[PDB]
Write a protein that binds this ligand. Structure first.
Ligand SMILES: Nc1ncnc2c1ncn2[C@@H]1O[C@H](COP(=O)(O)OP(=O)(O)OP(=O)(O)O)[C@@H](O)[C@H]1O
Ligand SMILES: [Mg+2]
Ligand SMILES: [Zn+2]
Lengths: 617, 163
DNA sequence: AAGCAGATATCAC
DNA sequence: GTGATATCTGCTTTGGGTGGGTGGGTGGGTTGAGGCAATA
């Protein structure tokens, strides 16, 4: 059989690269990575193109110019490099991915001259299709002689063997496909679009079809901005091609036997071997392991700091002057309580909701923005919404299908995170009624035409509101200043007010702070802890589930009795559970395993100042 | 909105005559004048492009003190008698000041830029923040959407109906 | 009517 | 006498409603009237 010299040389050199390339530490970089390919779910190896370029520049150039031609041989080299380990079945297939290609091309630079070369592009995913199994090499039985033919390559069309393997056999038409000994690969089709940055001025966006295979399937989601590394190929019009096993199914080139009197056109698709984001079962021990040693000692030092509450408060909100209590409340919301389930299967809410009622231009939006920028999972939205979904689900009809579907709202998109809601007093009646269940039961229930669903809304809500008159009236109570109903107010753990103090000194402090922030953007900010440090510390601290002790039990019971005796707003069991949640969050803040009385004292201070502020002018 | 402007139609006869002469002259404008205006527009476009390319103004110390004093005075106006300003307006001033510095092709924001920003902001407010009944200083119409006099009148009506 | 799949007789070497 | 290779024969096609809505609208067909949810 004729032998492709270039591809074989590439295979040999790639095997050498895999075996010999050395990391900084002196170990073989890719031996330890290939050691992971013994698992059944893992079949792809990610190789940095810069490492390969350092090892051998001629090999890298040959791969770049003949990627489509030589890729199967690189996969064969990987198979050889993995063959030693006993756990791999002989039937397993392995694939190579290439990570860091120095140069990038635009979607409108994908011309015919790029067919078969290694390329990297960026795009916004518009649509993802279901996963399929795709045949790569078929095993067939010959019906004339019962000989078994293996490794029949497929070319965009279901192909059967051309001639029987047996020299005596002359069969050309009768074969049987055997699925159990054939080879399949995972297959996914995605449709991507030009990013808004790349879209030329006054031009309709240009779309592209990308094919993901093996591990790359289900790794990109619609709306994501992703970098794809792979190759540009042509895909013929399969509908025109006729084969012994497959009839044709209802200008281009003419003259192929499989074409009859028909024409064959082509279209360009991108065959991606690697997908990444364009801009890039937990437990305390695993969280620790994910961190480096420096980060772990920083987290421990943070846990040991005796001024942690104040340092965290100042670090999180450096641009805001004053309002220390509001910062403390928002921090406690960020740490959260311990969600629990009862013996009968019902849930006890562990999340904390906070409300901030403010005068105009009092920086409540600043609080919401700080939390939104800090939190990994956080959604910022307005009470008055642009879409029909709003803060909860909506039911909309697909015109073509006539089917009814759920459109998700803000509280659904923020599930397991934080929802910052601005202008919380402008909600509509549908959202107003649904938010009862959303805030307490943490679910949204729908029984409408074509839809019957319970949707998860396990969220912590941080809300910002305006007073009814547009200016806060100290003579009245907080309940008298806002338009929130009493049942909604009972669902909030903490309430805060921000009043415009018509004071010269406060005005002078705020003006100096703003002007200093603008004059020296970098120099103005001074955080005891960096935001990344706080993110790691919060990730570590959320793994603790402090237990309520007996003394804390007695203190909580006494405080609840006092609150009820003191008192359409009223002290309900919700205040008791809010106090429990706040105590749990206070204990969590110090990575502690038991809720001590001190945490209860602090939580009761905050909650008592919230309740009194709700009641009296 | 940083600036709100009011384009009112006057009842003056002299304004009508002047605008009529303006429009008739435009109706008879010659081709050389049109070409000259096109050239001036091209110069303006090039100037703006260059300024966006290479100018990044920064606040000097004198500009910072000017801005702080400006905000304090705007607050004082209301504090003398209500509220006559809110911190967001200060931000607007900064933006405007920087814009002015960019017009000069200057990398430093000076006191002249702050003065121009104050003048422009104060003119826009005098155009659009005026209460038809009493005066201008009241900015509560922007913050709350209801005139202070209207708020007092509604409070009186509600109290009387509660009587 | 138009064209591919299958069957089969037929030239040539 | 075997390997092409030229001739002959039978299948089914079309989009279509006597080929079904107990095939399915991700296999593809204007126009109007009729329920929904969100709407005002
Ligand atoms: N206490 C404060 N400390 C620092 N900056 C403040 C403070 N109060 C207001 N500001 C400034 O005011 C602006 C914040 O306005 P923001 O949009 O957050 O107000 P708001 O409370 O949402 O009001 P509204 O919704 O009525 O506009 C920023 O310039 C912020 O610097
Ligand atoms: Mg705001
Ligand atoms: Zn055979």
């Amino acid at each position: 059989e004729v032998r492709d010299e270039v591809a074989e040389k590439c295979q040999k050199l790639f095997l050498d690269f895999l075996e010999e390339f050395q990391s900084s530490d002196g170990e073989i970089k890719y031996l330890q990575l290939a050691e992971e390919l013994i698992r059944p779910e893992r079949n792809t190896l990610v190789v940095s193109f810069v490492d390969l370029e350092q090892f051998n520049q001629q090999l890298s150039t040959t791969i770049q110019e003949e990627f489509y031609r030589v890729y199967p041989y690189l996969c064969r080299a990987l198979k050889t490099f993995v063959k030693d380990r006993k756990e791999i079945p002989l039937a397993k297939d392995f694939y190579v991915a290439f990570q860091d290609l120095p140069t990038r091309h635009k979607i409108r630079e994908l011309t015919s001259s790029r067919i078969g070369l290694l390329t990297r592009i960026s795009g916004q995913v518009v649509r993802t299709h279901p996963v399929h199994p795709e045949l790569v090499s078929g095993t067939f039985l010959c019906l004339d002689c019962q000989t078994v033919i293996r490794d029949v390559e497929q070319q965009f069309k279901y192909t059967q063997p051309n001639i029987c393997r047996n020299p005596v056999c002359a069969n050309r038409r009768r074969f049987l496909l055997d699925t159990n000994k054939s080879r399949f690969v995972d297959f996914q089709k995605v449709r991507i679009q030009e990013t808004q940055a790349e879209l030329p001025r006054g031009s309709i966006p240009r779309s592209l079809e990308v094919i993901l295979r093996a591990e790359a399937v289900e790794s990109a989601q619609a709306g994501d901005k992703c970098d794809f590394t792979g190759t540009l190929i042509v895909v013929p019009d399969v509908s025109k091609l006729s084969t012994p096993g497959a009839r044709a199914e209802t200008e281009g080139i003419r003259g192929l036997r499989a074409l009859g009197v028909r024409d064959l056109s082509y279209r360009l698709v991108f065959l991606a071997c690697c997908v990444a984001p364009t801009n890039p079962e937990q437990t305390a021990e695993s969280i620790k392991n994910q961190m480096t040693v420096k980060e772990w000692e920083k987290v421990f030092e943070m846990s040991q700091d005796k001024n942690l509450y104040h340092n965290l408060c100042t670090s999180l909100f450096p641009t805001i002057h004053g309002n220390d209590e509001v910062k403390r409340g928002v921090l406690l919301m960020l740490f959260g309580g311990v969600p629990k389930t009862t013996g009968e299967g019902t849930s006890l809410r562990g999340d904390i909701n906070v409300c901030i009622v403010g005068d105009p231009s009092t920086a409540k939006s600043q609080f919401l923005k700080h939390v939104e920028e800090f939190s990994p999972r956080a959604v910022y939205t307005s009470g008055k919404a642009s879409s029909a979904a709003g803060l909860t689900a909506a039911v909309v009809r697909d015109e073509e299908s006539h089917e009814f579907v759920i459109e998700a709202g803000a509280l659904m998109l923020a599930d397991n995170g934080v929802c910052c809601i601005d202008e919380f007093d402008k909600m509509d009646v549908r959202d107003q009624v649904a938010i009862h269940e959303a805030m307490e039961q943490q679910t949204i229930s729908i029984t409408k035409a074509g839809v019957k669903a319970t949707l998860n809304a396990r969220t912590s809500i941080l809300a910002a509101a305006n007073p009814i008159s547009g200016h806060y009236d100290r003579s009245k109570s907080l309940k008298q200043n806002i338009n929130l109903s009493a049942p909604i107010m009972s669902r909030f753990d903490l309430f805060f007010i921000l009043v415009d103090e018509c004071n010269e000194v406060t005005d002078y402090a705020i003006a100096r702070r703003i002007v200093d922030l603008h004059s020296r953007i970098e120099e103005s900010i001074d955080r005891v802890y960096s935001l990344d440090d706080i993110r790691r510390y919060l990730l570590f601290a959320r793994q603790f589930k402090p237990k309520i002790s007996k003394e804390s039990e007695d203190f909580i019971v006494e405080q609840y009795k006092h609150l009820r005796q003191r008192d359409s707003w009223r002290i309900t069991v919700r205040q008791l559970e809010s106090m429990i949640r706040l105590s749990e969050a206070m204990a969590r803040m110090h990575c502690c395993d038991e809720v001590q009385p001190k945490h209860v004292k602090e939580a009761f201070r905050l909650l008592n100042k919230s309740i009194i502020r709700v009641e009296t002018p | 909105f940083d600036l709100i402007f009011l384009l009112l139609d006057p009842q003056d006869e002299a304004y009508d005559r002047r605008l009529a002469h303006h429009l008739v002259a435009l109706y008879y404008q010659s081709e050389e004048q049109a070409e000259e205006e096109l050239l001036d527009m091209a110069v303006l476009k090039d100037y703006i492009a260059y300024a966006h390319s290479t100018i990044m103004p920064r606040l000097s110390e004198e500009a910072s003190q000017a801005l702080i004093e400006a905000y304090v005075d705007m607050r004082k106006i209301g504090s003398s008698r209500m509220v006559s300003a809110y911190p967001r307006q200060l931000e607007s001033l900064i933006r405007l000041a920087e814009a002015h510095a960019k017009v000069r092709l200057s990398n430093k924001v000076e006191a002249i830029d702050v003065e121009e920003a104050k003048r422009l902001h104060r003119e826009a407010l005098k155009q659009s923040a005026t209460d038809p009944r009493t005066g201008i200083v009241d900015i509560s119409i922007l913050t709350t959407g209801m005139s202070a006099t209207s708020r007092k009148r509604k409070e009186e009506l509600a109290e009387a109906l509660k009587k």
